[PDB]
Amino acid sequence: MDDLLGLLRIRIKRGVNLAVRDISSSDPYVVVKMGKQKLKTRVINKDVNPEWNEDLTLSVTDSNLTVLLTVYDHDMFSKDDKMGDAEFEIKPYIEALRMQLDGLPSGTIVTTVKPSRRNCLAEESRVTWVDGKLVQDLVLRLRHVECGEVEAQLQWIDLPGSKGL
Ligand SMILES: [Ca+2]
Ligand SMILES: [Ca+2]
């Protein structure tokens, strides 16, 4: 609690045109890693366009951290094949959370992160103040695989008793 800024909600929305790692399909799930934390979504059966809509919750004590996202094909009785990976920075979002935004009109775009050679963004990622919440919408193009994107949204949970932002 004495280092905790808050909890980062990562909503893993969907995968789009993921790689085939069975015969004609895959059984994808996502593993999210940050620091010593490792979280997993459920498996979606036989769908390379899986709609996970699954909330993962990480503890954040460090605005300078990176989130790693790796997709795998679940094979019940054998090894799980890699289906690509991506990473993103949380600093822009944490920075934005620390701004004065009570008073900003809903729909206000606080920060835009551009795709670059180094990052995994498939398109510009907006940090938006909307419906009284700050969110970041991400489309991640997966590395180290022949196709696939993962769409995710960042949200924030304040934990009373913590260090806070
Ligand atoms: Ca397989
Ligand atoms: Ca499989």
From Swiss-Prot:
Record CDD domains: C2_ArfGAP (cd04038)
Family matches, as Gene3D superfamilies: C2 domain (2.60.40.150)
One function term, GO molecular function aspect: GTPase activator activity
Compartments, record wording: Cell membrane; Nucleus; Cytoplasm, Cytosol
Positions contributing to Ca(2+) 1 binding: 21-22, 73, 75, 81
UniProt-listed Pfam families: C2
The C2 domain, residue ranges: 1-106
Effect of residue 75 to A: Impaired Ca(2+)-dependent phospholipids binding and reduced abscisic acid (ABA) sensitivity, as well as altered membrane localization and PYR1 binding
GO biological process per UniProt: abscisic acid-activated signaling pathway; defense response; positive regulation of abscisic acid-activated signaling pathway; positive regulation of defense response to bacterium; positive regulation of response to salt stress; response to salt stress
GO cellular component: cytosol; nucleus; plasma membrane
InterPro entries referenced in this protein's UniProt entry, alphabetically: C2_dom, C2_domain_sf, CAR1-11
Similarity comment: Belongs to the plant CAR protein family.
Subunit architecture: Dimers and oligomers. Binds to PYR/PYL/RCAR abscisic acid intracellular receptors in an ABA-independent manner, both at the plasma membrane and in the nucleus. Interacts directly with PYR1, PYL1, PYL4, PYL6 and PYL8. Binds phospholipids in a Ca(2+)-dependent manner. Interacts with YchF1.
Protein function: Mediates the transient calcium-dependent interaction of PYR/PYL/RCAR abscisic acid (ABA) receptors with the plasma membrane and thus regulates ABA sensitivity. Stimulates the GTPase/ATPase activities of YchF1, and regulates its subcellular localization. Promotes tolerance towards salinity stress by limiting the accumulation of reactive oxygen species (ROS). Promotes resistance to bacterial pathogens (e.g. Xanthomonas oryzae pv. oryzae and P.syringae pv. tomato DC3000).
Protein name: Protein C2-DOMAIN ABA-RELATED 4
Taxon lineage: Eukaryota, Viridiplantae, Streptophyta, Embryophyta, Tracheophyta
